[PDB]
Amino acid sequence: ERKISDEECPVRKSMQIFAGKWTLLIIFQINRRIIRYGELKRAIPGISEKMLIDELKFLCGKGLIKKKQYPEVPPRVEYSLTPLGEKVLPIIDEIAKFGMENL
Amino acid sequence: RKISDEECPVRKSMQIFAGKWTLLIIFQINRRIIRYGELKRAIPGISEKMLIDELKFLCGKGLIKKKQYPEVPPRVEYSLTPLGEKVLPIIDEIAKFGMENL
């Protein structure tokens, strides 16, 4: 007998954000640095352009990553983690550990 | 630093954990034994098809054990394998994120 996972469950709430096949990997790649869009895309080979920018939009909307605009020649977007997004890194540490030990 | 290619431990893990339901199911089975029907009720809004495909996926990935009892009335029970129990520290961090920020 354990508490059920209704729409209030803290794990179920979290999986609304993190359920993507790319969400946590993007956060993993950004990490504690500033990364250009192009570097980010090359840091996750196989992710399509569409899957990257919908996911980048999603994460901005959730306040997990921040976007810096540079309207210069040539122009660029830079992404970094917010303090909220930084709170996801402990989850990712544990995922990395699982992978390295078991896969 | 290190790119998320085929040799990336995070990328490898997300092949398994990407589901809407995967981590929720592991979380609900947890360190006990649970019948299909109890587990179905423990995650409201999951369809029969979703739960069955996911259970089969998790068995295939060696994360949960299925045990049939061909008796009257019949039952399937699920528990975590030792590999599955190693997913619980991930889920603890997710639960922590959920209650603190959501």
Short mmCIF file of C-alpha atoms in Angstrom, two decimals:
data_model
loop_
_atom_site.label_atom_id
_atom_site.label_comp_id
_atom_site.label_asym_id
_atom_site.label_seq_id
_atom_site.Cartn_x
_atom_site.Cartn_y
_atom_site.Cartn_z
CA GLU A 1 0.00 0.00 0.00
CA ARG A 2 1.59 3.22 -1.28
CA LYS A 3 0.23 6.66 -2.28
CA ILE A 4 -1.25 6.63 -5.81
CA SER A 5 0.09 8.66 -8.73
CA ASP A 6 -2.86 10.91 -9.54
CA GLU A 7 -2.48 14.39 -11.05
CA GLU A 8 -1.03 15.56 -7.72
CA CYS A 9 1.84 13.03 -7.56
CA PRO A 10 5.22 14.86 -7.53
CA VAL A 11 6.68 12.23 -9.88
CA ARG A 12 3.71 12.46 -12.28
CA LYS A 13 3.90 16.27 -12.22
CA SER A 14 7.61 16.07 -13.11
CA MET A 15 7.12 13.61 -15.98
CA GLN A 16 4.87 16.18 -17.73
CA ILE A 17 8.05 18.23 -18.27
CA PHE A 18 10.69 15.48 -18.52
CA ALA A 19 8.89 12.77 -20.53
CA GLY A 20 10.38 13.85 -23.86
CA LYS A 21 13.03 11.73 -25.57
CA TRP A 22 15.11 14.93 -25.82
CA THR A 23 14.18 17.09 -22.80
CA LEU A 24 16.68 15.76 -20.23
CA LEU A 25 19.45 15.28 -22.81
CA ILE A 26 19.21 18.93 -23.85
CA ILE A 27 19.47 19.98 -20.18
CA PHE A 28 22.41 17.54 -19.81
CA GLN A 29 24.19 19.16 -22.77
CA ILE A 30 23.57 22.78 -21.74
CA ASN A 31 24.71 21.91 -18.18
CA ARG A 32 26.53 24.77 -16.40
CA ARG A 33 27.72 26.64 -19.45
CA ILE A 34 26.57 28.81 -22.33
CA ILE A 35 25.94 26.94 -25.55
CA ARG A 36 25.12 28.20 -29.04
CA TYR A 37 22.18 26.53 -30.81
CA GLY A 38 24.51 24.98 -33.42
CA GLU A 39 26.87 23.51 -30.81
CA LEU A 40 23.83 22.12 -28.94
CA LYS A 41 22.48 20.44 -32.09
CA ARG A 42 25.92 18.92 -32.76
CA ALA A 43 26.12 17.80 -29.10
CA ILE A 44 23.02 15.59 -29.72
CA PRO A 45 23.49 14.00 -33.18
CA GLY A 46 20.30 12.51 -34.64
CA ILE A 47 17.89 15.11 -33.24
CA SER A 48 16.09 16.86 -36.13
CA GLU A 49 15.88 20.66 -36.43
CA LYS A 50 12.14 20.57 -35.63
CA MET A 51 12.55 18.34 -32.56
CA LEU A 52 15.28 20.69 -31.21
CA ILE A 53 13.38 24.00 -31.49
CA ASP A 54 10.00 22.73 -30.25
CA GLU A 55 11.91 21.28 -27.28
CA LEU A 56 13.94 24.50 -26.84
CA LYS A 57 10.63 26.43 -26.90
CA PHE A 58 9.00 24.04 -24.41
CA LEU A 59 11.93 24.37 -21.96
CA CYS A 60 11.96 28.19 -22.22
CA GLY A 61 8.19 28.15 -21.53
CA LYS A 62 8.76 26.02 -18.42
CA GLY A 63 11.44 28.45 -17.20
CA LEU A 64 14.12 25.76 -17.26
CA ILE A 65 16.46 27.35 -19.80
CA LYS A 66 17.07 31.00 -20.80
CA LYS A 67 17.59 32.40 -24.33
CA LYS A 68 20.07 35.18 -25.25
CA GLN A 69 19.43 36.90 -28.59
CA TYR A 70 22.31 38.40 -30.63
CA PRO A 71 20.87 40.33 -33.63
CA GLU A 72 24.33 40.99 -35.13
CA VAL A 73 26.26 39.80 -38.19
CA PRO A 74 26.28 36.84 -38.21
CA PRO A 75 23.46 36.38 -35.67
CA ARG A 76 23.28 33.77 -32.88
CA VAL A 77 21.16 32.32 -30.05
CA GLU A 78 22.80 31.27 -26.79
CA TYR A 79 21.16 29.06 -24.17
CA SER A 80 21.93 28.52 -20.49
CA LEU A 81 20.14 26.95 -17.55
CA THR A 82 18.02 28.99 -15.16
CA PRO A 83 18.35 28.35 -11.40
CA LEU A 84 15.24 26.15 -11.79
CA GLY A 85 16.82 24.24 -14.71
CA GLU A 86 19.92 23.80 -12.58
CA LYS A 87 17.71 21.83 -10.10
CA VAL A 88 17.28 19.16 -12.82
CA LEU A 89 21.03 18.33 -12.88
CA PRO A 90 20.83 16.05 -9.78
CA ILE A 91 18.26 13.90 -11.65
CA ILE A 92 20.62 13.74 -14.61
CA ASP A 93 23.64 12.80 -12.46
CA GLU A 94 21.63 9.81 -11.29
CA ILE A 95 20.63 8.91 -14.89
CA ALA A 96 24.28 9.10 -15.99
CA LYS A 97 25.28 6.88 -13.08
CA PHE A 98 22.59 4.32 -14.04
CA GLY A 99 23.81 4.23 -17.62
CA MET A 100 27.53 3.90 -16.74
CA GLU A 101 26.98 1.18 -14.20
CA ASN A 102 24.29 -0.85 -15.98
CA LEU A 103 24.27 -0.15 -19.69
CA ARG B 1 32.75 18.44 -23.00
CA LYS B 2 31.52 14.97 -24.04
CA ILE B 3 28.89 14.79 -26.83
CA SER B 4 25.69 12.74 -26.40
CA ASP B 5 26.35 10.10 -29.06
CA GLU B 6 25.80 6.33 -28.92
CA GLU B 7 28.36 5.93 -26.15
CA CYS B 8 26.58 8.47 -23.89
CA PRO B 9 25.27 6.96 -20.66
CA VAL B 10 22.52 9.58 -20.42
CA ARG B 11 21.47 8.96 -24.01
CA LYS B 12 21.48 5.18 -23.45
CA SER B 13 19.28 5.62 -20.36
CA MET B 14 16.79 7.87 -22.14
CA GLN B 15 16.13 5.08 -24.69
CA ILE B 16 14.54 3.33 -21.73
CA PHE B 17 13.15 6.16 -19.57
CA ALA B 18 11.65 8.42 -22.27
CA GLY B 19 8.15 7.02 -21.86
CA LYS B 20 5.27 9.05 -20.43
CA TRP B 21 4.65 5.98 -18.23
CA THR B 22 7.96 4.13 -17.75
CA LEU B 23 9.30 5.84 -14.63
CA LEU B 24 5.82 6.18 -13.11
CA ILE B 25 5.32 2.40 -13.36
CA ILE B 26 8.76 1.61 -11.87
CA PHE B 27 7.96 4.15 -9.06
CA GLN B 28 4.61 2.43 -8.30
CA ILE B 29 5.95 -1.14 -8.32
CA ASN B 30 8.79 0.15 -6.14
CA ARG B 31 10.14 -2.37 -3.57
CA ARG B 32 6.90 -4.36 -3.30
CA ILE B 33 4.89 -6.91 -5.31
CA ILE B 34 1.87 -5.52 -7.14
CA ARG B 35 -0.97 -7.11 -9.13
CA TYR B 36 -1.82 -5.76 -12.60
CA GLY B 37 -5.15 -4.40 -11.33
CA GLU B 38 -3.63 -2.61 -8.33
CA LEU B 39 -0.98 -1.08 -10.64
CA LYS B 40 -3.62 -0.02 -13.17
CA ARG B 41 -5.52 1.77 -10.37
CA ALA B 42 -2.27 3.29 -8.95
CA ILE B 43 -1.79 5.27 -12.18
CA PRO B 44 -5.20 6.81 -13.01
CA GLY B 45 -5.79 7.56 -16.71
CA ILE B 46 -3.52 4.87 -18.15
CA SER B 47 -5.24 2.66 -20.74
CA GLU B 48 -5.10 -1.12 -20.80
CA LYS B 49 -3.06 -0.95 -24.04
CA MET B 50 -0.55 1.58 -22.65
CA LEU B 51 -0.04 -0.39 -19.42
CA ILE B 52 0.43 -3.69 -21.25
CA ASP B 53 2.85 -2.38 -23.89
CA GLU B 54 4.82 -0.61 -21.14
CA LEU B 55 4.89 -3.72 -18.90
CA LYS B 56 6.12 -5.80 -21.84
CA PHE B 57 8.72 -3.13 -22.70
CA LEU B 58 9.96 -3.10 -19.05
CA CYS B 59 10.09 -6.91 -18.87
CA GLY B 60 12.01 -6.92 -22.13
CA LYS B 61 14.42 -4.35 -20.73
CA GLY B 62 14.92 -6.58 -17.64
CA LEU B 63 13.63 -3.90 -15.20
CA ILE B 64 10.62 -5.78 -13.80
CA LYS B 65 9.68 -9.44 -13.11
CA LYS B 66 6.33 -10.92 -14.19
CA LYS B 67 4.98 -13.91 -12.24
CA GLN B 68 1.85 -15.78 -13.33
CA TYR B 69 -0.33 -17.84 -11.06
CA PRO B 70 -2.54 -20.18 -13.19
CA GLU B 71 -5.02 -20.67 -10.33
CA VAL B 72 -8.64 -19.65 -9.62
CA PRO B 73 -8.95 -16.71 -9.94
CA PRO B 74 -5.72 -16.14 -11.90
CA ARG B 75 -3.23 -13.32 -11.22
CA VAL B 76 -0.06 -11.70 -12.59
CA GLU B 77 2.24 -9.99 -10.11
CA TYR B 78 5.12 -7.61 -10.85
CA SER B 79 8.15 -6.69 -8.85
CA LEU B 80 11.39 -4.95 -9.68
CA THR B 81 14.51 -6.81 -10.65
CA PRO B 82 17.75 -5.62 -9.00
CA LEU B 83 18.37 -3.63 -12.24
CA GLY B 84 14.91 -1.97 -11.80
CA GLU B 85 15.65 -1.09 -8.13
CA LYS B 86 18.66 0.87 -9.42
CA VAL B 87 16.22 3.19 -11.15
CA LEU B 88 14.77 4.27 -7.76
CA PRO B 89 17.56 6.82 -6.98
CA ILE B 90 16.65 8.58 -10.29
CA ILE B 91 13.01 8.64 -9.29
CA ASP B 92 13.82 9.94 -5.76
CA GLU B 93 15.48 12.97 -7.41
CA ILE B 94 12.42 13.47 -9.68
CA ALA B 95 10.03 13.27 -6.69
CA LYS B 96 12.23 15.84 -4.94
CA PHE B 97 12.06 18.17 -7.98
CA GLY B 98 8.26 17.72 -8.15
CA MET B 99 7.49 18.57 -4.54
CA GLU B 100 9.94 21.49 -4.31
CA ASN B 101 9.26 23.35 -7.55
CA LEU B 102 5.92 22.11 -8.83
#
